[PDB]
């Protein structure tokens, strides 16, 4: 059964063709020379024959690393065709040297040129000898045959993102690596079918940058690399391009910590007790330091807050003072009486006000100096915007209540939507947001930092899962409300809903149903809310079954699926925990390196020495030879780093590899050709 | 007579047949051979459950062959020839039918499919999410106008605009959201009738709901016809749709019965159980839940919620097995608790009996009530004083409280955590093939919108067509292509080139890239 | 690097033998 | 587009230098001895030449485990 016959394998070789191809396989120089010289008097051989699996004589010699046979075959004018491409793809430097100077079916997509394929292989010798000839690589655009176009763009981006080609070309390999990683990251969004591939390419670029910066042997040279165009400009550029590995390089972090302390030799050899005491000490006198920087910003103490760690401590202390003021705002000992519309704000709120104004001013300055796109990329910035909007609402509502409600009356008799009541509500919400803004100050801590960053990195999966849960919630709310809205009850009870001792109507309105099904997932909804004031046991049973199915779906199915997805997320997230945390800590640290934004918010709003000169003039709009010297000195540094990188990760890393079956075949072929020579010459 | 030799020989001649080299040297169409052979090996992994693993592995290998034979395409015209081989996209539909997930999820297939998914929207990759959102809401908002144009003038510059798969997907989604919003309005006291009315004489909202219900039933009937009844139930969403439409049919029938048997009106509190109107409201509410859950299937279209929704659907089978075990545990403890407590069933005093009451009285006095008590015990909604009786029998109460406590230990701190553990193991593997499975599901969803049939949304689905009687009367009245050969040869040349490339690039070079042994 | 060493030993052996006969 | 040119790869080898480094690669003791003895009468070879990726003749012999060539090179 099933007789087996050859299909789509047309060509078969004659005995002479097999003998000659076998001679080329074995390395037999004498037999190949003989068969080739017998291929010109009376041909009868088809010098360019093709074995099974293709594998032409020239290509065979290329696969065997036999240069003598390659020179002979080229001397007898064989059809090279794609010989150069197979030589390059196999990283065969000698054959590439021979085929570069020598005067339908293919294994390569017709858009593949020699330089593109060489850069794909990342072999520095072949790329070097191709570039000297004068090759060029096409330039794709910013960011009829869709398959060919997408494949060609991928091929010329994989060539461009090659450490060897970036090292042989591209005046600044660092800028090229940054820009190319950014471009590939964007393309992994535009070309979502090849996303993975582009992402991998992007990742590769990032490591190149890191591994090009690991070749620094001196802190002066590393400082030159990082301060290239106020200061630390190239590091800020790396931050902007999201080069996490480049930033988290150990030498970068060491230099950054040295600039983070600036007056505190130690803090590594110091015991945690002295650290804690001195941080509390400086935090306690933050107002004095800020005052000195206000009045005499050049003294032995006015410059002390200019140090990034000191001013980070001062900002943290001012924020903790603010939060403690919010805590005092809810104490009956320093508040006014509740039976007062238009409260005429107390002392604590007055003291709170400068912090609020300073926070708003800081957020405005960030929104200006940095734009509005980069500003919202940080979620803490969105939280700050909501916080300050809520405080503005508090101030406005208090003002409105003061100029419209001059009378006092007991609070129980007040009417809903009273400006004072809404003011207290929005102020409380703003208090929650202000106190949550305190978790961002843990990227500075080496223990709570990686954890806080990783928890922030799990939120997106939580949001997707919560969107699915909201759909499930809406489905069951629709059903339960449809079942129960005919038995809405008012007579008797004086408090209606689920927020009452005897939980009455729970599915009688869509809003109330939504709350009931929300609080059901914490067990705060009793089982007797599924009853009605009638003997309708069927409707009650159906409602209890909707409610029970919702609890099964949400509490023992979806919740556990959330646990499973979180576990999968945290497996990967914890791998890049230190890298991401160090990126975040670098951002936090670098935010305290500038001269702007030095005073904490309470002192932020203080009329400066001029205070009108940069205020009036700001609205009134309606011979550096050091640059070239810096550029050349950076060029020498970069030359040395690229030399070191090529030596230590292209020449030695390639050597440290694992030899495949092709290496055994090459060894066997060398032994066989040696054998044939010796036997034939004696 | 010799089971060992027979099974081993069959395995040996299936492992030979499922060989990329042998499929490339023989088998006029390697694609059809790979599809059929993967299907056969998948079935044998069920029949021969002792060698299951092995057969499954073989099946998997076949699938990759198909994928890796399609990765050898260098042109979109040649790939189109491969996929349109026998209306259109026939070979891709065949791959869908044989469950060739890797072949379907090949990047070039997906690129071609997306190009056919948009058809009027150059961009949508370079466009910002804001413009996308605005234009989808815009087209969804005027879905009725587009459907009307396709009704009256299905050849104009606007009648053909709904013919585009993405546009008609947006139109169907908009009609479904309109339906769900109508169900939401159905439970508002501002557009409903009074509760003290038997035989409600359906209101305006229910009247507007009716065309959607009829269109949904008609769509489900057409799917059950054009596709058979075996492939139809393989999709679980189809079973959910069948239940939904059965429930809506029950709602209509019960409302009709109540209208022709209960012409009087009386307060609802005095109604009797099993009243047709009450049952109508109950089944309508259940159907509302199912209709609103039918909205999660429209997330396979989304690249963010799609892989997640598919993976969550892929964990359900383990949940079902675990819940079967839990139901046995539940039945065991229900039997025990009912046996202990059924002598103290109490009626005097209380007016509401069971656990659904403020003071939770008899909770283990009947088997049904015991089942409910033990079900709600796992959410903490059953109080601890239901284990007491009206007697001083502290021994029976203690034994009952110990049964109840052992059931809570087994279910809430043992079985539930075992479920978490099994789910974690499942999701480890499931998330590996997340993109492949999601892209298969999205291809199915997309391809369902490529045909001319089923273009109008359900409210407009039930509209007498221009003829409307010609294909209705005639349907029941039963009781020289030389392009074919040319297409076949052109496909043969394409296939020759792909097999040549595959042999060159994965048999000759992949073998070379290996690791030399001793 | 071990394959490269082996190939180099074979080549040097080859050159010696060919050069001494 | 994107014309590609060599940067920061200054030094390139003459034909004699490539021949001598290739001889050191292949292990050719006779060729290396000849080129080194021809590197003292009329040098014209730059005995300490450097290949791409560095990889000097002595370093090449070190990477090839060739002790004979190493002794010869040190002898010169
Ligand atoms: C270890 C925890 C296990 C969790 C419990 C498993 C349920 C086992 C069956 C319990 C039956 C006992 C009660 C019998 C009496 C009765 O009628 O009671 C029915 C009970 C409560 O009703 P009553 O109190 O009125 O009797 O309700 C239910 O039992 C509903 C259970 C439905 C299970 C649904 C699971 C499907 C998985 C969800 C898919 C995920 C995505 C979905 C989103 C779209
Ligand atoms: C961290 C969570 C740990 C969970 C709790 C562990 C239980 C520890 C022991 C508690 C004892 C304290 C109470 C002592 C007084 C008393 O008599 O109280 C007994 C309590 C409650 O009874 P009372 O309220 O009447 O006193 O009941 C129990 O303690 C029952 C516990 C039994 C544990 C069973 C575990 C076996 C694992 C299940 C196998 C899985 C599959 C099974 C399906 C077939
Ligand atoms: Ca901010
Ligand atoms: Ca269906």
Numbering used by the authors:
A (entry chain B): 17 to 119, 135 to 174, 187 to 272, 284 to 676, 694 to 753
B (entry chain C): 187 to 272, 284 to 676, 694 to 732
C (entry chain A): 733 to 753
D (entry chain A): 17 to 92
From the paper:
Here we report five cryo-EM structures of TRPC4 in its apo form and in complex with the inhibitors GFB-8438, GFB-9289, and GFB-8749, as well as CaM. Within the TRPC1/4/5 sub-group, TRPC4 and TRPC5 share the highest sequence identity of 70%. Both proteins can form homo-tetrameric channels that allow the passage of Ca2+, but also Na+ ions to a lesser extent. The architecture is typical for the canonical TRP channel family with a transmembrane region (TM domain) where the pore region of one protomer domain-swaps with the voltage-sensor-like (VSL) domain of another. The cytosolic domain harboring the ankyrin repeat (AR) embraces the coiled coil helix in the center and the N-terminal ankyrin domain is associated with the TM domain via a helical linker domain.
To be able to identify CaM-induced structural effects, we also solved the structure of TRPC4 in its apo state under the same conditions as for the TRPC4-CaM complex without the addition of external lipids. The apo structure of TRPC4 in LMNG reached a resolution of 2.85 Å, allowing us to build an atomic model with high accuracy. The overall structure is similar to the previously reported amphipol-exchanged apo structure of TRPC4 in the closed state. However, in both the apo and CaM-bound structure, we observed for the first time an additional density corresponding to a horizontal helix located at the transmembrane-cytoplasmic interface outside the transmembrane core (residues 666–676). The hydrophobic residues of this helix face the transmembrane helix and the inner lipid leaflet while the hydrophilic residues project into the cytoplasm, giving the helix an amphipathic nature. Comparing the TRPC4 apo structure with that of TRPC4-CaM, we could identify only small differences in the center of the channel. Both, the apo and CaM-bound TRPC4 structures showed the same constriction of 0.7 Å defined by N621 at the lower gate indicating the closed state of the channel. The differences between TRPC4-CaM and the TRPC4 apo structure are more pronounced at the periphery of the channel.
